[PDB]
Amino acid sequence: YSKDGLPNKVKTEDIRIRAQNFKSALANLEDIIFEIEKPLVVPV
């Protein structure tokens, strides 16, 4: 339903690319990188 309140049939292709976008994004997850302070370690 749009702003006017009129029913709009969602295309059968619309949901297809939604699955293509989801399956592609879920297959390769971005590696979560977080750093922790280590005052006990020293360089060479």
Partner 1 sequence: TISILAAPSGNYKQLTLVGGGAKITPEMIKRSLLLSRVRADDLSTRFNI
CB of 10 to partner 1, least distance (A): 15
Phi, psi of 33 (to 5 degrees): -105, 120
CA pair distance 21, 23, nearest whole angstrom? 6
Q: Whole-number minimum distance, CB 1 to partner 1, in Å?
A: 6
Q: Which is nearer to partner 1, 1 or 34 (CB)?
A: 1
Residues 1-44 within binding reach of partner 1 (CB under 8 A): 1, 5, 7
d(C-alpha 26, C-alpha 17), whole Å:
14
Which residues of this chain interact with partner 1, rule CB under 8 A? 1, 5, 7
